A paper describes a structure:
The SEA complex (SEAC) is a growth regulator that acts as a GTPase-activating protein (GAP) towards Gtr1, a Rag GTPase that relays nutrient status to the Target of Rapamycin Complex 1 (TORC1) in yeast. The SEAC has a modular structure in which a COPII-like cage corresponding to SEACAT binds two flexible wings, which correspond to SEACIT. The wings are tethered to the core via Sea3, which forms part of both modules.
After extensive sample and data collection optimization, a cryogenic electron microscopy (cryo-EM) reconstruction of the SEAC at an average resolution of 3.0 Å was attained. The SEAC forms a hollow, C2-symmetric cage-like structure with dimensions of approximately 251 Å × 302 Å × 240 Å, containing 22 protein chains with a mass of approximately 2 MDa. There are two copies of each subunit, except for Sea4 and Seh1, which are present in four and six copies, respectively. A flexible linker (Sea3 connector) that tethers the wings to the core but is not visible in the density connects the Sea3SIP and Sea3SAP. Sea2–Seh1 and Sea3–Sec13 dimers each interact with one copy of Sea4–Seh1 via heterodimerization of their zinc-containing RING domains, explaining why Sea4 is present in a 2:1 ratio compared to Sea2 and Sea3.
Residue numbers in the entry:
A (entry chain F): 1 to 249, 287 to 348
B (entry chain A): 128 to 158, 161 to 182, 211 to 290, 298 to 322, 337 to 399, 433 to 556, 654 to 679, 694 to 712, ...
C (entry chain C): 994 to 1061, 1073 to 1077
D (entry chain B): 937 to 972, 988 to 1038
The structure:
Amino acid sequence: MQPFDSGHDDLVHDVVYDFYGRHVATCSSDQHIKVFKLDKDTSNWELSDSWRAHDSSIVAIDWASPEYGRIIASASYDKTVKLWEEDPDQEECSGRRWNKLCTLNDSKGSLYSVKFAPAHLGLKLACLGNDGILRLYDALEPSDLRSWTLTSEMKVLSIPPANHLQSDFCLSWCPSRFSPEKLAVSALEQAIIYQRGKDGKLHVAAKLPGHKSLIRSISWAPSIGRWYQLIATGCKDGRIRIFKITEKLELQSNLQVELLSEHDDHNGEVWSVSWNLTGTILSSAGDDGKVRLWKATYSNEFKCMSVITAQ
Amino acid sequence: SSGLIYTTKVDKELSSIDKVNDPNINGLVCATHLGLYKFSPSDRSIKCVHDFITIADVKTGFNNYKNCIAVCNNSTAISIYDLNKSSSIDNPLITSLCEHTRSINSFDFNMVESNLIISGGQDSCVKIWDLRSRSDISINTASDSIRDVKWMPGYNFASGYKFASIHDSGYLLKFDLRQPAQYEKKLNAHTGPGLCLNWHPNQEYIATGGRDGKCCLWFVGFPKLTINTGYPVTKLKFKPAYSSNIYNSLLGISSMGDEAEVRIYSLARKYIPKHVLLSETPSLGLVWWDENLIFNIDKGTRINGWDINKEPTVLENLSKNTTTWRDLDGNGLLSVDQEIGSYEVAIEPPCIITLDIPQIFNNIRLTKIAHNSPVEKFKYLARQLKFSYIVEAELQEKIQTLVDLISIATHNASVYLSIDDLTNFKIWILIRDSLLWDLKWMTSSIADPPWDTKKLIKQLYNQATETGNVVLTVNILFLFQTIYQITEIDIAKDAIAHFLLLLHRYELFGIAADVLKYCPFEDIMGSEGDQSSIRLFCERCGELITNESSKEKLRAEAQQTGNKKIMDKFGYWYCDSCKKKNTSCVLCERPLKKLTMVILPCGHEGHFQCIQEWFLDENEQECPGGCPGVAFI
Amino acid sequence: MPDIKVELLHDDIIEAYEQEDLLHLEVSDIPKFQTYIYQYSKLLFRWGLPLERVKILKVSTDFRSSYSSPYNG
Amino acid sequence: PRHKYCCPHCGSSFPRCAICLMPLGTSNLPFVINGTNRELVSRKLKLNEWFSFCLSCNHGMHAGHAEEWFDRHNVCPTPGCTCQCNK
Ligand SMILES: [Zn+2]
Ligand SMILES: [Zn+2]
Ligand SMILES: [Zn+2]
Ligand SMILES: [Zn+2]
Ligand SMILES: [Zn+2]
Ligand SMILES: [Zn+2]
Ligand SMILES: [Zn+2]
């Protein structure tokens, strides 16, 4: 693979893979979404569609599960979440390929994070924004993609933020198919894990400590066979925090949180963290143009493996 | 916020706000309230209120008429007021002006000639009055509904004889004081009604806005800049400054409705705002006191004030870089190589950095030691490994299970030794010898020793799941979970599900089918059971093809006999209710029993060879049976 | 396209290439090698095997010199 | 419904494929079914994603997925089914 130059007229905010790794959707602040495809010939990225989605900066994007179709969901500063289903009959690079499904204009504040649930929960979607409440949108009938019902409205804050311009929200789902449903909320300076009990409603399970500044990213780790789970949080202060979550079977399981590691190696501000599919290597991108990869050592302590510079 | 300075509350409703153009005093006029709202920096309060006694906006006079305030009350006339004539004895009324036959939408005092005022509205006539003296000069606008008319600003820094008009017809009409009844410059501003009109403080640039939600910049000395706000914009107020370049202009975009906020856009970055100053209630009007302070009113009747020199920037808070992973090794790892610009003179197109981490790392390693392709390795180990296993009777079954598990371990060790990775050949040799130890103690029949079978297999599992060897831990979870309880059933099933999702992420679906077919856990992917079952209704009688009588008869015959080949006569190609014999191919008209190929729009069966020949070798596009349509390819 | 600079920090492959030993043992791994080897050397000298105790003490002394006078004068 | 087939009464999709667990009756899948003169190759590739099923065990597959599965195996890919759909 080689780096490719986008057609974006401003900063690219959130970039999210599809399931198969053959498509890249880049949302940017220029009110545009550009979905790319990986051609088998010549091994270079070619643009597939590029259309205007919102009336402001799109700050989050996420692909749906491949069994439900080619669905992306975009959250922006227009207090809306708009879904897009790909129509393959239209020509590429035309602007009419991706058709809007539904607009979930229910947040009084600008929405910061959108995340799809794991595929074994059904087509379930999450929203977090400036209003300070977590919204869950389910398609109870996945037959029609235009029928979204708000199924959970949980207040993640004691009070809404007065300083609306200085805030940042993030969400991360738990991909464990047979553990109970867990959701991570990083509202302003906390981090709360939410579980679904027998009541069918979200409850506070555990709180990740520390986090002296705003949380710019959160990422649950896919634990393939491990007896513990990992949560990676990037902060405005610049500290990577990896939390070792242990689960033992009203909630059906109690969670204990142990701060496994803390890393302030980004001399500045960390904007994104993301595990790989093993839950072993963790990426971390800062505002200095540097990307660091973290792998756990022989002890229970992560160390930096490489630094990627974009000179 | 940080830049918030002044706030208060008002017990009654408000409509508009304007600034007293006076460098000595620090008051404001809020619009039937007309209060000289004075703020003081000592206490940061606007508690100094002088209670001096609709689709309109209040405006204050300029130059020699430094104390005149105009407001509309009866929607038919302009009422002028004086702040000095506010005593009880003094009459608080100035001679009103009334010629509009319809509602008045806008008026504005002039900044160069204090004795001249402008207005407009639904009467389709722009009129000019005189304050030292019915209007003097009247200009017809050809049946265009005036919404806003603003003078050309003087703004004496280190002229005023022209004005423009916005209209419901979407036309911007530049005029002249010395040229009545003849517009100087005519421009088509917006589709639909235009609701905004203002001039740039220094250069002759006009920025408008309407129901289209596109704040378009026009040169009056297809637009210059276009800001697709999307919402119907209602108010624009440029900051008071000397902008030598037109792109360094701070512009206040605001709307009216349930979602109203003070948005201060710099023209250098038309996609990101600079200040998203927000109040607890939707706002109505915003004015600029000076180069720094900007106030507003709201539906909650709070006179809030902000300082733009002490406010966080929206660009700094936005996300700057992102990372995602594609697979285990890191064949696809992304970033964005974007630079942050400024709000003064736009951005080079950002480069998404897709990196082949294993290839780069192998290059750096071979460079460092001079003084492959682990995705293909994952495919090879997913394909060529043996994941699947398939009172004296229990002992014999356990012995046979140990024996063919030893055989599976030997095969896995051999296929690791085929590709020459000794680090897992050693693991499977250890597992094979532990199973042989368990077999010899079953045949022969404080803490456990480290060479105990369960403890050693669990420790190799833990080392595999700490290192990151997905294939080896998943193989151990299939082969040695029921007999040796390694972890909980939830963790094992989650690992198998994640391995199958990982196999689905690559184009390895037959391997995932092999893995799921002989999985000891029956509820790994899906809980509906038979999700690939296709029940059919009969083409002749319409009842469902379940064929329970035939299955019962064949089960009875296979129970009375000793062969399982009688049960191979069961099928869904025949109906028991209507005695349909067989299903015929659409091309060769032969019986069809074991594999078909359904044509979708018409519902016809067919062999692989027949359908493939008809649609590739003969290059045909219709159904062989003949259908009103094209079942192409 | 820009120029990407990659800096490996503490790569395991390079460190394995920079190691001539099969294992990187430490005193924390084997805390009591000296006493056990010395006592078994005494037991070997009580038997008719006087060379095996010298072999085992040479191994122990080689490891002791690796991580860090009756035959002098 | 020239590119996606669903039930007219409720809208639910077709039964899933036994190999890739994608709903059947839908064209333009995210992947390429390269199952077991560029026009004939493209026709074969777009022919591989069709609706194929056995009339003895009633288990559905894509045409390319069934061709690639039965080039190495001889049993139905669904767990719990013993039906030699090849011959
Ligand atoms: Zn019938
Ligand atoms: Zn045939
Ligand atoms: Zn037909
Ligand atoms: Zn149905
Ligand atoms: Zn399939
Ligand atoms: Zn079957
Ligand atoms: Zn079959």
